[PDB]
Amino acid sequence: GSHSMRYFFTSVSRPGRGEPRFIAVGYVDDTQFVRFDSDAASQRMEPRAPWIEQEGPEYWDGETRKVKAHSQTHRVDLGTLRGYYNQSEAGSHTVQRMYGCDVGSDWRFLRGYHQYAYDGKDYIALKEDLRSWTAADMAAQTTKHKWEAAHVAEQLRAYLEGTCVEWLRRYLENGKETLQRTDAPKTHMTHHAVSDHEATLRCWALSFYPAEITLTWQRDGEDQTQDTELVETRPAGDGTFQKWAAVVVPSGQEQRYTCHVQHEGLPKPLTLRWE
């Protein structure tokens, strides 16, 4: 299907405890592949997927260089923002940055993004034309002006439409067995009495990849949106994902209920019934 490469960066100040904590991670789709942690022993960009381990010392040294530079700039950024917002030196604050690219079915560029948050709120974002900025307030408009005069959108556009996409494709190819797979959910249903007059029916989707899925309950064909307990999709830890949806069913009505499963691994959506 579609694919994405994204990098995520968190920088957190911690006053009276020296240097800001810096964490960087990279994903292709729902698969993490690199990390850097500023409090770790190594001080290196490190592999987190088997298919990126084959990249040579040039890759690893180049990524380590860039990531240690980012660490430094975000440390400066934290002071800058504290200055913009008139904040005291004694409080802990968070800058987050995320960028990357989307490709379609045919591995051709679909969209690029490059966005920052300060203290969990949108701060500045590259718009979809990759040429202009959304700035939240006066502080972020301060940043926008710096970036327009340094032509930051231009360099970012070149990266997002070229290099990003090129490297996404290489990773896709190199990690074919992991990244280009589609794992259909393994599904089952459980039934548990909560009283003598009610039971929970729970429809499970297990070991699926990628993470995108729709799980819904119907009663005589009408959606039970308001009455379904639905958990957030969650990582199993082996590179696959899980989800369940549950309904409370008055005893004797189990056959009215259907669980519906859509995932890119399923040729046709599944309909499951307790019977």
């Binding site: 990098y7 960066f9 990279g26 890759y59 860039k66 800058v95 990003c164």
Partner: peptide, 9 residues
């Protein structure tokens, strides 16, 4: 592969 820079805020 990352973008080379983080532009200062």
């Amino acid at each position: 592969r990352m973008f080379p820079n983080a532009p200062y805020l």
